[PDB]
Design a protein around this ligand. Sequence first.
Ligand SMILES: Cc1cc(OC[C@@H]2CN(C)c3ccccc3O2)cc(C)c1C(=O)Nc1ccc(Cl)c(C2(C(=O)O)CC2)c1
Ligand SMILES: *[C@@H]1O[C@H](CO)[C@@H](O)[C@H](O)[C@H]1NC(C)=O
Lengths: 212, 225, 417, 120
Amino acid sequence: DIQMTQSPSSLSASVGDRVTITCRASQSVSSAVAWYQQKPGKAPKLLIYSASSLYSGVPSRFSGSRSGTDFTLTISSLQPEDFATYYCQQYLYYSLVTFGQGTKVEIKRTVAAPSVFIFPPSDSQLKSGTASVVCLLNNFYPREAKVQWKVDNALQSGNSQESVTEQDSKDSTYSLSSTLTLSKADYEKHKVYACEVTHQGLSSPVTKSFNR
Amino acid sequence: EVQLVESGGGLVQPGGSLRLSCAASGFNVVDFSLHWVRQAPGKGLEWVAYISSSSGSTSYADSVKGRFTISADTSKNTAYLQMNSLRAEDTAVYYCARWGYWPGEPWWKAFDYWGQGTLVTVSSASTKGPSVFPLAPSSKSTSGGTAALGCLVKDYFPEPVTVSWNSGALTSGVHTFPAVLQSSGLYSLSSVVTVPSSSLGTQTYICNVNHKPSNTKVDKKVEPK
Amino acid sequence: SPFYRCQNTTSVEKGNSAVMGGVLFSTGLLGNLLALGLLARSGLSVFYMLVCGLTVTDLLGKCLLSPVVLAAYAQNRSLRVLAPALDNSLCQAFAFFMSFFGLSSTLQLLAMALERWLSLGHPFFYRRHITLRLGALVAPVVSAFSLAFCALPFMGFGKFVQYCPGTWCFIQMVHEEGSLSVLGYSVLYSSLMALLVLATVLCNLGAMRNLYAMHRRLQADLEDNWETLNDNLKVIEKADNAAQVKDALTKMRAAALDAQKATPPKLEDKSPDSPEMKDFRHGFDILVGQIDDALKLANEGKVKEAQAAAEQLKTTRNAYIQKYLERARSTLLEELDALLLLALMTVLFTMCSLPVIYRAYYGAFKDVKEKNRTSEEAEDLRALRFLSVISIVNPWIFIIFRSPVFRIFFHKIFIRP
Amino acid sequence: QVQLQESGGGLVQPGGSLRLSCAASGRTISRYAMSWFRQAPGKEREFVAVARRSGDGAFYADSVQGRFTVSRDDAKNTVYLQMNSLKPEDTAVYYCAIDSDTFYSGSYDYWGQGTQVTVS
Ligand SMILES: Cc1cc(OC[C@@H]2CN(C)c3ccccc3O2)cc(C)c1C(=O)Nc1ccc(Cl)c(C2(C(=O)O)CC2)c1
Ligand SMILES: *[C@@H]1O[C@H](CO)[C@@H](O)[C@H](O)[C@H]1NC(C)=O
């Protein structure tokens, strides 16, 4: 089972940069290596098919090279339509086909610090028998942000589901939602809840609390 | 004029059966080998199975082998994959692709054509209606002239659910987050928006949620507390 | 107080060494005649036409100059008194012919080295306009140039002087009390000899590096992939169970594809549409197809046809893709032989001519003062003797390099390192 | 644990360049990220720039992108803040911090002492 290792995983660049992605094979597959590009909600497309050969219709800014079971894909000057995910494949026999793990490319801008909000549970949901508390992080860059939830001291055992939007089309920033849901009786044990948000563009963590 | 179109994907109970048909267009299936590929939601790609009808050769992946079978009908120009012991890990999008024969350039180009894919979901759940809750802002603590306001949609099945604000009037500064599969087998979702703090307490806000399979339409009004 | 005592000496008294000159001339004559017999009759490139010209030029040098020295030393007379019909003309002609032959031979050796370097390094330029006409019109051109060049002292730019004991003659180098028309010819001659030797050495080194590149390019692709194919066939033919058969067959397939990418040393100028490459690629394609059907039959379904398929693969491998390998290896060994012959000839010529250049520059403008009587004539004779004795050793190199048993042992020797 | 030093801070004319050096006395800076922070006499600390691991990139603030620049040296594991085209509102005390999270989550625990930059 021949394996493929792809580097890096996330790349941030700007229009006009020079981009290099590396794939590595476990054994020698000669020059039987292909590259594919995929966008969300679509089927993959072929770019290179012999580690150095361009498929018909692909623009010439895509280049591929082979050296000692090390394969390189290069984009000389990035364009706004190249923000997608990229895969490397080895094919040796009909039963010997293996894919890579992918690499996503996105846009670079200046650091912005998140804005933090907290919402208490509604009264109608308490009748049903559940209580859900939601914490919102708005308009931050880069994507790496951390949320810590506590009641009195580091209550992170409780399940807290997080969802992240895609990169915004206007200002290329991010929004994140963290939901913490418990039973009704567990909502009546304590009185204070708080969020603590940390980010790279912030001297000290931001805490937001409410009291029952 | 070359296409690959699949059909036969849908919701089945665990342990069920399903037959997926790939119907080649513009070329003879006898002269080309063909393969099945699948992709899980939010993951990578994975090869599944292989048939060559000229040589009568057939191969499967390690997990698929023993459970799925693949056949070819040349007069009908169609390949079949019969799926017999379906589990929750089979929930994915499925593709049928082609591959040429040695010798020549036909072998060297691996996967020059794919299909659009069909979605197979395996879950033992029935249609349900969502429930809606508000997220009230507090004018006491919303300093800086900005406030946040939204509503929460919970416990529906299956996908999808559409959320709108003020019947589509509010389209600026609104964020809707992707659905998350809960442990109960259902989904949850949230919608938020930001408003100036001066306008808070003078204008009402409405969020509307629509679900087609269960035929549900709910409007909820959010007010400051 | 002239520098040379024996400038006007009319008699010779020494130790009856004329017989030594006779035996040395006899050995040189038999070596030249046997060498001109051996290859030029039994053996039959542009290398060998130049070698033939070199041998005949050397033979005409020996048959002309050694008789005069031997006759003067035998008639017990100086070179001005040996022949009464011509007293100074014998000395002038002797020195003139010595210098002329010494220059022309070096020009021929330089042409040999340059031609071999160009042939081995850049094949397109070599093939375009270098043929047997070029190899046939080297000696007349270089000999005419040297014979025109070595006539300056007869024109008024140098001097020929008889050296003690009066049996030799050569250009004078140790000057007057001071002059401008005696420095010029000596330094010009030695400068030309030095430049020719330097160019020859550089060409030798370049040709050696190009041959090393050729050896490495052969040894990587075809040879290492062939070794891999042999090992994979062996491990398939000695195996149990159908687990490792797929892995061994895939390794063999990868090695076969990489080997099909390779290029033989010959028929490489035209990579596409050459039949010598097309059937190479066809044989590798047939082998890959056999591998594919063996994989299909014995790996998708469990059956023991893999051993018979491996036997058939070995049978079709050992038939008609060994000829290319053997042709390539033979070509490399013949190239190595040609380069070794050049190296030995260059070593001899460079060794046995530097005393003349050093002596010419030592007697000219590098002399605050020189002890003159017993320390310069005995040193001056040695350079002339070495420049003459270049002639004897030249054809014996070729004889040893094409001997029945000696060359066979030599070839068995130098292939190993 | 670590010991950080800031080199620089002499009086410089308006419009003149300057270079500040942030040096960690040993340890390792190879897998971490480095950050620079302002502090005015009457305000709070503000983000200036960050240098990530090699091959990923560097980031600046919105009042900093045009002029300042951040360079990194793994031989002596130091970072350099080179500033150009200064104006009298840039005078402040500068501090250097180390991010302890390898997943690029902002967590600064070591601050040093900082240096005063004055513009006449
Ligand atoms: C003169 C002579 C000329 C010659 O080549 C002709 C030409 C000229 N040159 C220099 C040349 C150079 C390169 C290629 C071709 C060339 O062709 C060859 C020989 C052997 C001799 C010879 O007789 N040498 C000699 C060597 C050692 C001794 Cl000990 C003696 C004796 C003594 O008393 O000196 C005992 C007599 C004589
Ligand atoms: C040789 O004779 C010439 C001509 O008379 C004379 O110039 C020269 O000095 C003589 N040399 C010796 C060494 O006797």
